[PDB]
């Protein structure tokens, strides 16, 4: 039994801390409006979604991204209070954060014990998946740029070790044209556009099949493709005949 007037939320049957439907609220003592966003209460930082519900998690304030923690995580903190959390990673569900000396979450590129990570500027959450950053293509897992062949919006790119091609940054997709790539014990072939080819291919008189999901040549034994079984050698070359 509450009402929302002109994007401002009020509850009747009210000011201060209110538990409603299990979810926690703080209606401003003066305006009776439900607090939204970063909110200071008794010198203690809290954070509410746009709907007024208090949150546990990592959210941006005027001093950067803060950790709004469950009860009794640090000192005797109240549920939802921002806490001191220094020089370490935080793992919340499948999200990863790195917290600095001033208990704020890292954003952008950061070097942690000699390893480089990228944390999304808008969430502080460890990057995952294809990303374009200052016109450079990266493919992230758990905040770490991956090396290998991964599928982006324009097909499979070669995300390479530093200085593979004219000083590319570590994990940056590079130009890599009309040639085989032998990488993870895996075999790939790259066309003129620097994308890995998939499917059946004839290259230098030999037949190959590059798996659609990974772009790796079928290699090292028996494979089923199109409902039948083929043998592919150690070099990815299809043997004669079909079983």
């Amino acid at each position, epitope marked *: 039994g509450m009402r929302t007037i002109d994007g401002k939320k009020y509850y009747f049957n009210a000011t201060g801390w209110q538990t409603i439907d299990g979810k926690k609220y703080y209606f401003n003592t003066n305006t009776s409006i439900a607090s939204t966003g970063y909110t200071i209460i008794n010198d203690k930082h809290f954070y509410f979604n746009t709907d007024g519900i208090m949150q546990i998690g990592v959210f941006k304030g005027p001093d950067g991204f803060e950790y709004f923690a469950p009860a009794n995580t640090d000192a005797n903190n109240i549920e939802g209070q921002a806490i001191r959390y220094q020089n370490r990673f935080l793992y919340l569900h499948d999200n990863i954060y790195y917290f600095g000396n001033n208990s704020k979450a890292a954003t952008g590129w950061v070097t942690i014990d000699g390893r480089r990570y990228y944390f999304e500027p808008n969430t502080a959450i460890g990057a995952n998946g294809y990303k374009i950053i200052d016109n450079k293509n990266f493919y992230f897992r758990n905040g770490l740029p991956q090396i290998g062949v991964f599928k982006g919006p324009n097909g499979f790119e070669y995300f390479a070790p530093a200085n593979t091609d004219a000083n590319n940054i570590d994990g940056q997709a590079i130009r890599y044209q009309n040639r085989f790539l032998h990488l993870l014990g895996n075999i790939y072939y790259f066309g003129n556009n620097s994308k890995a080819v998939t499917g059946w291919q004839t290259i230098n008189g030999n037949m190959y099949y590059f*798996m659609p999901d990974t772009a790796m040549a*079928a290699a*090292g*034994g*028996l*494979f*089923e*493709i199109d*409902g*039948v*079984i083929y043998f592919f050698g150690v070099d990815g070359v299809k043997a004669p005949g*079909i*079983y």
Partner: nanobody
Amino acid sequence: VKLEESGGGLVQAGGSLRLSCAASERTFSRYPVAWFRQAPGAEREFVAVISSTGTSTYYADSVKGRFTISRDNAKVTVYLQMNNLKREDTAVYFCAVNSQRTRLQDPNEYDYWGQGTQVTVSS
């Protein structure tokens, strides 16, 4: 995919058995299906594989000519006909699906397995 093997048991050398591997879902028919066998103490050794369609097969050398792998996708079932059985054929037999369709002889590449059925060849 859930798989259930049946048809094993005790048998005299030179005899025969037909093993069955039944699934519960039609999606079975999308994937190649293999038999592996495990003797006590030993590792799961490859026996035969059949393609999703049933038109393409491959057998280990030791069973070639004696065993025949087949399937009936209407009954969502794969069969292994085992003729002229030998003492060396004694083992638990498992059927397995390889949904990635890669490296069909390698048991590690198979993600769905039956519970197994015992085959024991006497004298």
